Structures are given as C-alpha cells and as structure tokens.
Ligand binder design. Structure first.
Ligand code: GDP
Ligand code: GDP
Lengths: 416, 178, 417, 177
C-alpha cells in the first residue's frame, strides 16, 4: 500500500510476465503502474486529471490502485509499455483507449509527426482486429480451477481456490504434471497427490499426512443476458470473473450410471478480480451451482446436437468430414447408447408417466428437430460424397430410416 | 482440407473411448458426463491456423466387423489401441486390427497405442495377472511389434493419470499430415 | 502473527461486549484460548486438553481451526470469560464443553474443591437449560442475506454477499432501513437503493448512478438427515453455516400466478465460517438452488400443514387459539384459494395425467393425512371450548365435511376422517 | 398464551397483503402464495415475546352471516381502510364499527389506514380528483378514531414497510389493556 513499494512490485511482475510469455498480464502491470502514477500526481497536486479512473475503459481492476498511502513524461512511458504488450498479447481492441490520452498530451505540443504516429498505430490496431476477429486465430488462454489442501504443507495457498489462466491451448495433461512437479519438490514427491474429483473437496476426507492439488478444467461463463456483449473472441476473454464446469452424479450416489439415473451438476466460480489481471492466477471467492435431473440432461444434449448439425449444414463451405463425424455419431451409434436410449427412457408411454408433462413435451419437440437436422445433414452429405462413400451414405440413410421407424413407434407419431 | 480424419480401433475395454473423451474434453475420466453419441472433435493449431481433429470411434466386437470398414474411406491416420495389461488385446493387434486396416487402407499411416499404462504398476492388477499365469506387456516388447508391423511409431498413455496422453495426439496429427 | 491476531480478538470481544452481542464476545475468548494454546504447544510447554493446541476446542466450534495459521493460568482465564458470556448469551448448553479443558487442568493439580466448583457450574447450566428449553423464551437472532452492488461506491463490500446475524426478532424493514441510512450517509441520500427482488442479481441490469443493497430474510437450513440432530432452539442456532430462502416464480417467467403454475425456487447459502463467530456478518462463499414444480409446491405446503396441525394436537397443553387459527385456516378458507385448490389442480383424473405418477400418489397420501389431521384437530378443539364457541365449532365441522365431500369426489375415494 | 386479533374491512384495502407482508417478513414482490387463511407472528413487547394469532375475515356481504362466528375469544380488533379509497373509510363508519361493537361490546379496536404509499403518488392523486375525491388525511381519520371510541389510529404501508411494525405493536398493547 506504499506507492513505490507497489510500483516496483508491478514492474517486477511485468518483467516476469514478459519472460514467461504472459503478455496480457504484462500489459496489465503497466496500465496499473500508469493508473498509480496518475493517482499519485493527482493527490500530490499536479493537474489525465481524474487519477486512477482515467483507465477504467481498459480494466476495472485498477480501482485497487486508489488504496495508496513521477511526472507526466513517465506516466506516458508506462502507457507506451502497455501498448507494446497489448500488441504482443493480441488484445488489439484496447490499443485505442490507451493511446487516446497520449494523443491529448501531444495535441497540446503541436507535434504533428507524433500525432500522425499515434493515429497510425490505432489504425493498424483496428486493421488487425478486422483481419483476425472471430477467426479462431487468437489463443487468449485456457482456464483451470486449482485448489490446495494440506495444512501441514501449504503456506499461504492452503485451503484456497484459484482460477489459473494458462497460455493458449494448455491441456489438462500439462498443467497437472507441472503443478505436481512444483509441489513435489518443496514437500516431497511421496506426499503430494492430484485430486481428480471436481466436487468441492471436504478436508476431513483427506489424509492429513498428504498434500493435495485439485485441478479442474473450466470455461468462461455467460448467460443469455450478457450475449448482447461478448460477440467476439476478444470480448469472451475481456474482463471476466465467472467460470463454469459440470460434474456427473447419479441418483444413487455414483458418478456414472444409466440414461435414466444420470444427472449433472453445473458449478459457476466467481473470482476476486477480473481477467486479465496483473497475475495469471486469481482467487475464487464464491460458488453457485444448479442441478439437472436425467430428463433434463437428455433435453440438454439433444438440443446441442440439433444445433451442431444445423450449424454444419448452413456453413458457406460445408466441412464434409466434420458433417460425417456428427451425422454418423447421431444416426448410427455403435459404442455409446445412442440417442434412442433417451427416447426409450423418457418418451415411451409407460416411462413418460414418471416425468413432468412439459418436460416430456419439450424432449419430444427436440427429437422432431433432431429428425429434420439428421435428414438435412444426410442431404448435404449426398451432394458432397464421391464414389468411395456411396455405401457409407446408403448405410447412414438405412440407419436413419430405422431410427425414424423406432422413434415413430415410441412417440406414436409419424416422423418424416 | 480443413479437417483431419483419425479413426480409432481396438478391442473393447482397452480404454479407447475413455482415452478420446478425456483428450477431447480436457477432463479426467471420472468427471465427464456420459454421452449417448459417438465420435469427438477438437480444434488443433497448424502454424497458427485452426483445424478440426475429428476422432471416429469404432466398436471392436465381432458383431460389428461387417459395417466398420465403411468408416475407413478418407481416413488420414489410424490409432490402433491395446491395453498394456491385457495381452489378448495386444495379440489381436497383430492378428486382427493391423491386417484389417492394412487391407482396406494400405497407404494410410497408423500408430500403435498402448493404454492404461498406470495399471502396469498396480499390485491388484499385476497379481490378478499372476493368478492367470500372464504378465503385463512391457514397452520394449510393444515397440518391437510396432517396427515389425510397419507402424509409424508406438505411443503409450494413461487416461487416468494423463501421462503420455498429449503426445499420442501430437504424434497422430503429425502422421495425419503424411 | 499471533500478537496482532490476539490484540484484534481482544478488541472485538470488548466491542461486542459493549453492544450486547454476547455470543460473539464468547466466541472471541474461545478463539483467544485456541490461539494461545497453539502458541504454547508449538513452543513445547508440555480428550480435550490444552496440550493438543487448537484442536482441543473443536467441539465448541470448528471455526478455531483458523487459529492454526503467557502461562497455563492465562489459558484458564480466557475460558472463564467465555463461560461468563456463554451464560449471559443463554448458550448454556455450551458451558459443559468449555469447562472440560479447565477440568483437565485442575485434575492434574488435584484441586478437588475447584473440580467441585466446575462440576457444580455445569450442573447449574443444565438446570437452566431444563427450565427454558424450546419455550421460545430464548431468541438467538434472525438472519438476513445482504449483498452489495456498486462498482463506484463500495470498497471491500462491493459485489459480495453476507449473512448478517441480527438481534432477537429484528424484522426485514428494520435491517433494511438501517442499512439504507448507514450507506446513505457515507454516499448520497439519493444514490442508495434497496434491491427487493431475491433472485440472484446480474450486474448488467443495474444503473451505475446508484448504490444497491439487496436484503432477503433467510432461516437456518437442514436437510432431512440433519433434522434429527437439530431438536432444540439452541441446536438450531449452534454451529450453522447454511441458510435458505424461497423465491416465487411461475412456469412462464413471472413471479406470481395460479396454483397450477406457481413454482418456488429454494436457494441455500453457505457462509465461510459457522455462526456464532467473532463477527456478526459472515461472507457467503457458496450457493446452490433447486426448483419446485407446482405439484412439488403443493406437496411441500400440504406436508407442512399436516405436520404443524399434528404437533398442535400433541402439545402438552394445547394453545386453543393457535389451534383454532390453523384449523379455521384449513377447513374454512374464504380469502385465499384453500387447500382444495391443490386437490382440484393436481388430483382430479384429467389433470393428474400431466404430472408424475409418484408425485400424484404422494400428494394423495398427504391429503389423507390432512383429512385425519383436521379431524384430530376438531376433536381436540371441542374438549377445550366454552359455550361461546359451540356454534363456531359446529360451523367448523360442517366446513370440514363439505371439504371431505369434495375431496372424495376429486380423489374418487371415500375420505372419512 | 396466544393473543387473538380479528381483522375486518371491505376488500381491496390491503388487509391480506398487509398481514402476509409482516408475518413472513418478506417484501411483497417476494412472498410465496399460500392456500391457507390466517397468520401467526411472534412479537417483542419490551423483552417479553408474544404470539399474535391474526384471524382474517372476508369483507364481502355474503359472509355477513357467519363472519361474526370468529368474534368469540377475540382480544383485539383491527378495522382497516385504504388512505386513497374514501369509501373504504366511509364504510368503516357505516358497517364495520357497528358490527364488531354489536357482537363484542367490551373488546378494544383500532382504526388502521392502509396503502399510505399511494397518497404521495402523482398518478393516484389525479385519479381521485376526477371523481371529486382526495386522499383522506391522518387528521380526519384521527378525528373519527376519537369519535367512535377506538383505542387509537395507526397508518401503514406494506410497500414502504414503514409504520406497519407500529400497527401490530399497538394492537398487542391494546389486547393487554
Ligand atoms: N485404470 C485405468 N482405467 C481405464 C483407463 N482408460 C479406461 N479405463 C477403464 O476401462 C474400462 C473400459 O474402457 P472404455 O472407455 O469403455 O474403452 P473401450 O471399450 O475401448 O471403448 C472403463 O471402466 C474405463 O474406466 C486408464 O487409463 N486407466
Ligand atoms: N401500493 C400498494 N398496494 C397495496 C398495498 N397493500 C395491498 N395492495 C394491493 O391491493 C390489492 C388488494 O389488496 P388485498 O391484499 O387483497 O386486500 P383485501 O382485499 O382487503 O384483503 C392487491 O393487488 C395489492 O397489491 C400497499 O401497501 N401499497
């Protein structure tokens, strides 16, 4: 909470982040520095002028810089470092709001060449966005809940939950083995275990003679009310603090069971600050969760499959292999239970009496859309296959027709 | 030319479905919600350009032998799986699976995949093979099969510990590109 | 650091003592004793003995685990203070557990007079409990969910949800206005608004021109497994971290509607520490929710009504007025829809086809218990009325049979009593 | 040891919303509907907690036959009216106070003004003006409360929840003489 104590810390993190390739965190460190300098000059009377609120368009996390107990040239130098790392981190959309206050500085000096430079650099920042936005080219990161358990072992990290923002496409394999090696050395490789269960750990269940690291993949979470914003790949990683994951549980008490006993829990973790932050891990401060019963699970995955099929069939250049993957995995399931196990468990007359009418009626309507979407996908495939997939297509149709016949028996309705 | 078709074969109960779900969802096997559909897709990066890796899941049982090769046309790479704690699945690699894919796709590269490698250091598992007068399949004996059968290479993994899992699909992508 | 933690707990205990929040003053002294014990143990000074460190106090409260992150006489002084405030806060049940480590000390010292006195103190606390248990004379407090929204106003409270433990029978408006004026004097009187809706707030729907304080009444929550261990008024306020509240919604997205559309969300909040604690307000760190369909709401309300009518008939001495209140309000409904609205909506043949068989048969069974419970309540009431209520009781019976006449038609089954 | 309190008044004044407001300790936006009649609330009168049983009555003319059967054993009555509905008040005098005084001549009662939030509402004030009407002042209502020998007169709003706690506190003090 001391100006230069906080400032050297942020500059240290900036350099660490730059070496580690956490380039957004580096950009954040510099914008937090610039925010601090601005608040300090404001409090120590200097006459941008609002203090730390000057950079709220960049991130609301800088509110914490106003917990404080340096000239205009160096504030601007902090902003240049910030733009460098926004460029390197591909968060091009923020470059404009960092340069705007610099522009105001140089407007006053009549430096027309500098102004030409600043407007130019906001120009390719938006050109780059025009070239890459929504093209799945930008790898802003993957997110993992990480929790540490073992009061005989862990220092400050004991009993607390983090969201780790990992680079690009880091998979579960890599962050697990990494964290395991890290804490196998400061505590001993014989006394550290990874918790794979994604339920909230209860410490009494754990051997106090061991240290545990729970690792669970999570994804940024938005509800339909927020999808008004969050229209781009950038916005899906810009100032976010909610993260979702699902956990399977049966009615009995197991993780896995049959279609009629399979539930799942939906958990949403909130973080103390927003990503991106001056750190690549942020602590979780709360959890909200809901549950879906077996007919709700079935309703959920059947809707998704209908949307997957329709999406592929309305692409400009339909992706034949990706269409077949989903089509064959809908109409000719051979390893899993197949979508007809849903129809048998929830739509047959005897079984349907055990569930709410509205939910039975919703799952019936989805299956109709499923029939159409498998049909539309079979037609799109026919216009794309060559001679070597004619038998393949004929069996898909044969499997589809056999499925509509059984579906028609079960629903007692003609499904075209 | 946006999508890699990779087809997965092997005997039942070697862990192939469980292998594909964990890599495709980035979850541990106990934590995925079971699905009634087949096949799995995941985006994979080639030189900074986005690709779909399509994973086609097949049933290994005899009842499925007539229709399974209909999935082989257009394949870019095969994963031939066996569990390293099931010498029957290992022998059927030589005596069933490699011949079947060789016959329908003689020019298509395939990888030999050992699964369930965590069970190689399991007492109950190593003892349960002792009472059956069998011993687990060591990595060295599995690389020899890979060279004999003209495999592109051998890879082991465990879906439970995730050890070696990523490298299997790294190796599969590189073979799928030719 | 132990020193700063101990100075803070000692300050809080005096502040709590000064404001009359005596349960929280008692908890501060048990935490100080936990902190000193762990300190002396980690230095090597030497069930339920101080030697164990903080784990010795785990039966009093699990909250003292956090003390695990100067004489033995001083430890005893802390526990005396706790007992004193345990007495004043009427948490007499706790006194036996706080005295155990004190007893262990004087056992080793063979201070048999002192052991005489401590066992005497425990006897008088259970004598006190025997005189007040579940009389509704003990008022341990009311709980409120309180959450703060205001990115431009609130400091550390911003975006965080707390459970506030309020004294005695503080009603919803009291804490609401108190919270309003408190933050209207730190902000602008025209910039603070109370969020009335109890659904979880999404920040997007808020105007940043004002500060928002969401206030909802909650009660301690226990599942059917727990209810065995939550028999008394003390037990229902002792070492609790789960609170529940219900929110009305309809199938169509409105809040209120007809009984065949009226649903109910049940939210369960969990706090980071258990009450009673060293503070009156504890952060919510967890919430889960679940949705009751209209027939499930019916099941819920009918089982409650059956149960409360049953325990009014089986009381030692029966509150005749409370018995007539509930009974008249079941068999002579004239303002609200009356419980036959549930029967007509869910149990009639054509309507029952829209709901699960198991829930329809369960709602049917509960209604049979409801017929028996009103029957039992009518018989108890006429043992207790004077001549001024014979005509009133007569019209309760006539209404009870007109209800059983309709319930028999709807269930297609003779309902006798 | 439960205090019996019967509440009377012609409908739409807010009797029932008032009672479920304060009993369930909820904002009116949030209360779960109930199929049952009557309410029981626990109250504090200087350290001593009490139980107030609240017997609701349907105000319509069809029930004038049987509604007085709830009157025996009453400890206090509440006669209600809406501060923006004049005839809600005009017929407190014409019908309600004659009826409850006839059946229980010695039981105390209070005049209660409800919906006070809508007397300081602009839309509501003009809807009254077109009918040649204006909201009833406290003073005119306190005039009347003295006229017919009520204990006192109180005002409440379930939307404000301001003044409502006072209504029941005064009811209990009345039932204790
Ligand atoms: N210990 C262990 N068990 C596994 C592994 N992979 C799969 N299994 C289990 O092996 C059983 C069969 O695997 P399954 O997914 O059906 O493989 P498939 O029959 O080839 O599709 C299941 O009970 C899995 O939990 C692994 O890596 N380790
Ligand atoms: N604005 C406002 N409306 C109210 C208040 N109390 C009740 N109401 C409304 O008045 C209507 C009828 O009131 P009700 O509770 O049925 O009173 P009753 O008919 O005499 O039992 C309902 O639509 C309520 O929303 C209040 O304090 N303020």
């Amino acid at each position: 909470s001391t100006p230069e104590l906080r400032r050297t810390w942020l500059e240290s993190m900036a350099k660490i982040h730059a070496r580690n390739g956490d380039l957004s965190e580096a950009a954040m460190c510099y914008i937090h520095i610039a925010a601090l300098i601005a608040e300090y000059l404001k409090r120590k009377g200097y006459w941008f002028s609002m203090g730390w609120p000057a950079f709220l368009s960049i991130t609301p996390n800088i509110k914490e810089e106003g917990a404080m107990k340096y000239n205009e040239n160096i504030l601007v130098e902090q902003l240049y470092m910030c733009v460098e790392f926004l460029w390197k981190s591909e968060r091009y959309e923020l470059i404009a709001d960092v340069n705007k206050p610099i522009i105001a500085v140089f407007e006053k000096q009549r430096d027309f060449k500098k102004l030409s430079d600043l407007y130019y650099d906001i120009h390719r920042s938006y050109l780059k966005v025009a070239e890459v936005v929504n093209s799945e080219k930008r790898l802003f990161g993957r997110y993992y809940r990480v929790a540490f358990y073992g009061q005989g072992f862990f220092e400050e990290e004991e009993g607390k939950e983090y969201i780790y923002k990992e680079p690009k496409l880091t998979g579960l394999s890599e962050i697990s083995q990494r964290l395991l090696k890290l804490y196998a050395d400061k505590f001993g490789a014989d006394n550290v275990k990874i918790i794979q269960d994604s339920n909230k750990v209860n410490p009494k269940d754990l051997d106090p003679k061991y240290a545990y690291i729970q690792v669970t993949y999570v994804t940024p979470f938005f509800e339909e009310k927020e999808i008004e914003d969050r229209k781009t790949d950038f916005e899906m990683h810009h100032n976010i603090n909610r993260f979702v994951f699902e956990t399977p549980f049966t009615l009995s008490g197991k993780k896995h069971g049959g279609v009629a006993e399979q539930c799942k829990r939906r958990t949403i973790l909130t973080t103390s600050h927003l990503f991106p932050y001056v750190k690549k891990r942020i602590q979780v401060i709360s959890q909200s969760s809901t549950e879906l019963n077996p007919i709700e699970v079935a309703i959920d995955e059947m809707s998704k499959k209908v949307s997957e099929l329709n999406q592929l069939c309305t692409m400009e250049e339909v992706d034949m292999i990706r269409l077949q993957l989903k089509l064959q995995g809908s109409v000719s399931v051979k390893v899993n239970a197949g979508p007809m196990a849903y129809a048998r468990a929830f739509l047959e007359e005897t079984n349907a009496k055990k569930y709410p009418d509205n939910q039975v009626k919703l799952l019936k309507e989805i299956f109709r859309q499923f029939a159409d979407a498998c049909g539309q996908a079979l037609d799109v495939n026919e216009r794309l296959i060559k001679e070597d997939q004619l038998e393949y297509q004929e069996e898909l149709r044969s499997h589809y027709k056999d499925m509509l016949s059984e579906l028609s028996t079960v629903m007692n309705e003609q499904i075209t | 030319m946006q999508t890699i078709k990779c087809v997965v074969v092997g005997d039942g109960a070697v862990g192939k479905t469980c292998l594909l779900i964990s890599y495709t969802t980035n979850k541990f096997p106990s934590e995925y919600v079971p699905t009634v559909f087949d096949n799995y897709a995941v985006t994979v990066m080639i030189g900074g350009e986005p690709y779909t890796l399509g994973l086609f899941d097949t049933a290994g049982q005899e009842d499925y032998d007539r229709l399974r090769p209909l999935s082989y046309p257009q394949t870019d790479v095969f994963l031939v799986c066996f569990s390293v704690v099931s010498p029957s699945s290992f022998e059927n690699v030589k005596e069933k699976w490699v011949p079947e894919i060789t016959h329908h796709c003689p020019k298509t590269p395939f990888l030999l995949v050992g699964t369930q490698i965590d069970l190689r250091d399991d007492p109950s598992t190593i003892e349960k093979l002792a009472k059956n007068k069998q011993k687990p399949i060591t990595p060295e004996t599995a690389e020899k099969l890979a060279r004999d059968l003209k495999a592109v290479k051998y890879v082991e993994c465990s879906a439970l510990t995730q050890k070696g899992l990523k490298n299997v699909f790294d190796e599969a992508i590189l073979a799928a590109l030719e």
